[PDB]
Amino acid sequence: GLMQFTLPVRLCKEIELFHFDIGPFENMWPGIFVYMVHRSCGTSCFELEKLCRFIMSVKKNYRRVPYHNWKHAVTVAHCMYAILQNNHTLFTDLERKGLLIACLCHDLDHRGFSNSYLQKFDHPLAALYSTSTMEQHHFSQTVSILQLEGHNIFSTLSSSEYEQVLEIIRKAIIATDLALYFGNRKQLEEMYQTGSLNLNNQSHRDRVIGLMMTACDLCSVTKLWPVTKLTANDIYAEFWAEGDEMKKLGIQPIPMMDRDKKDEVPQGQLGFYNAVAIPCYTTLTQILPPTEPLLKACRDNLSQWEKVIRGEE
């Protein structure tokens, strides 16, 4: 109960900032996560014995893929931590519990392949879940780990609080399906402008949490340029592997997945920042003003991709 996690001074300071990189020392990521749960949620939000066993089972269930890996899980949880800490009063105790765990679990057992590749391959998961295929898998995997003897970090919730947090986690994980983000942000955009946005309305709260999950999921575009640039390599390592596998099914990959279009990457990043990233952080900043630093970091990185195209780097 009196056992706090403590970080070194540079991490103690930088972990509070949106652009923090969790670093290359894997053995520190669990401790970083528990630190964030303790400060965001409380030191008695979870039984430390059960949390530690939950964290290590989650880690074991992420795979050795270039991008959709354990580092990504913890990276996405830290962006949620920074959103939650900069918005103290807006979120319930259950939401602060549920959302960090959602973020840690949101890509559980990812194979490095898109929902489209599973469908075209005709993978079993594509028969079990017709839409948001991997995301329904990720929630399934989260429930299974929670049901391992000794892994129920939620045991000392009431019956209804337990059903509520699992529903928060399910919606949060489904919402990381980028196919659903476009419609979600347009709805939130209309509501905010016409003034109908209402945070006591549960269906509105759900939408807001959806956007937060997208914002945390894409947070590589909100880091310092060298982190953004080097993460993009990991993203394309998966994309181009999927493109190879499409060619093996005798399907031409979309340009995103085609290693033969390395040359156009800087222009592909522009479209992604303009069509997805900037709109996401803009609407998030309008709803939660203290998340402005994410939008400013994203615009800085947009400007860096513009410099690469103009040959300046």
Binding residues for 3',5'-cyclic AMP: 68, 269
Query: Binding Mg ion by CB under 5 A: which of 54, 97, 107, 171?
Result: 107
> CA–CA separation, 277 vs 149, rounded Å?
40
Candidates 71-79, 138-146, 265-273, 279-287: pick the segment binding ligand IFI (CB under 6 A): 265-273
For residue 234, count CB atoms less than 10 angstroms from its CB and return exposed for 0-12, middle for 13-18, buried for 19 or more: middle
Q: Which of 39, 63, 204, 261 binds ligand IFI (CB under 6 A)?
A: 261
Q: Which does 255 bind (CB under 5 to 8 A by kind): ligand IFI, Mg ion, Zn ion, none?
A: ligand IFI
Q: How far apart are CA 161 and CA 45, in angstroms?
A: 13
Report which residue's Cβ sits closest to ligand IFI: 268
* Contacted by 86, from Mg ion, ligand IFI, Zn ion, none: CB < 5 to 8 Å by type: none
Instruction: From 90, 103, 92, select the one nearest 32 (Cα to Cα).
Output: 103
If the CB atoms of residues 69 and 304 are measured against Zn ion, the closer one turns out to be 69
Q: How many residues bind ligand IFI (CB under 6 A)?
A: 15
Residue whose structure tokens are 């900032």:
17
Q: Which of residues 158-177 bind Mg ion (CB under 5 A)?
A: 176
Q: In the bound complex, what is the minimum distance in angstroms from residue 106's beta carbon to Zn ion?
A: 5
Provide the Cα torsion 260, 264, 268, 274; round to 10°.
Answer: -170
- Residue type at position 21: D
- Of 132, 139, 131, 138, the C-alpha closest to 111 is 138
| Known active-site residue 68 | yes
Among the listed residues 109, 135, 177, 217, the single contact to Zn ion using CB under 5 A:
217
Of 91, 95, 258, nearest in space to 169 by CA: 95
Altogether, the residues listed in the chain come to a count of 313
The residue within the footprint of Zn ion, chosen from 95, 107, 109, 258 (CB under 5 A), is 107
Q: Does 238 help bind Zn ion (rule: CB under 5 A)? A: no
Q: Residue 233: is it exposed, middle or buried by C-beta count within 10 angstroms (0-12/13-18/19+)?
A: exposed
Site residues, ligand IFI (CB under 6 A): 178, 218, 220-221, 232, 235, 255-256, 261, 264-265, 267-268, 271-272
Residues engaged in binding Mg ion (CB under 5 A): 107, 176
Binding site for Zn ion (CB under 5 A): 107, 217
Residues belonging to the active site: 68
